[PDB]
RNA sequence: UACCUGGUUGAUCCUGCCAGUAGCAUAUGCUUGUCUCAAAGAUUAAGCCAUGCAUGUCUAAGUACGCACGGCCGGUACAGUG
């Protein structure tokens, strides 16, 4: 299941301004950023040993 | 600039100190137009202190769900400034 979709946002409401609803930033996530930052220290490990 | 002068005697020559003489540091008195640099609560009390200030700090890169903001797009987890 995508955590993505079960992200309780915020129901902001205030006078003239347009509705808002905000949703917090899902931190211990494994993004394509995560992956490639264990990918270059494993990279590291190679250099170092050749 | 490697310097002396007055004072003991009726007069003399000495010993010897007193006073004079020049700088330099603190205080003080009188006087003071221009211009440059410039010390400054050490001395006595390392005594006592009203009040204000003298130490804070964010980048692309630790943590942003403050609508605090003008503004995107609307199922977008997080647009940005903060």
Same mark, same amino acid.
């Given at each position: 299941?995508?955590?993505?979709?079960?992200?309780?946002?915020?129901?902001?409401?205030?006078?003239?301004? !347009?509705? =808002?609803?905000? #949703?917090? @930033?899902? *931190? $211990?996530?494994?993004?394509?950023?995560?992956?490639?930052? !264990?990918? =270059?220290?494993? #990279?590291? @490990?190679? *250099? $170092?040993?050749?």
């Amino acid at each position: 299941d995508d955590v993505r979709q079960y992200v309780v946002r915020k129901p902001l409401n205030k006078e003239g301004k !347009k509705p =808002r609803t905000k #949703a917090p @930033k899902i *931190q $211990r996530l494994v993004t394509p950023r995560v992956l490639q930052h !264990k990918r =270059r220290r494993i #990279a590291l @490990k190679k *250099q $170092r040993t050749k």
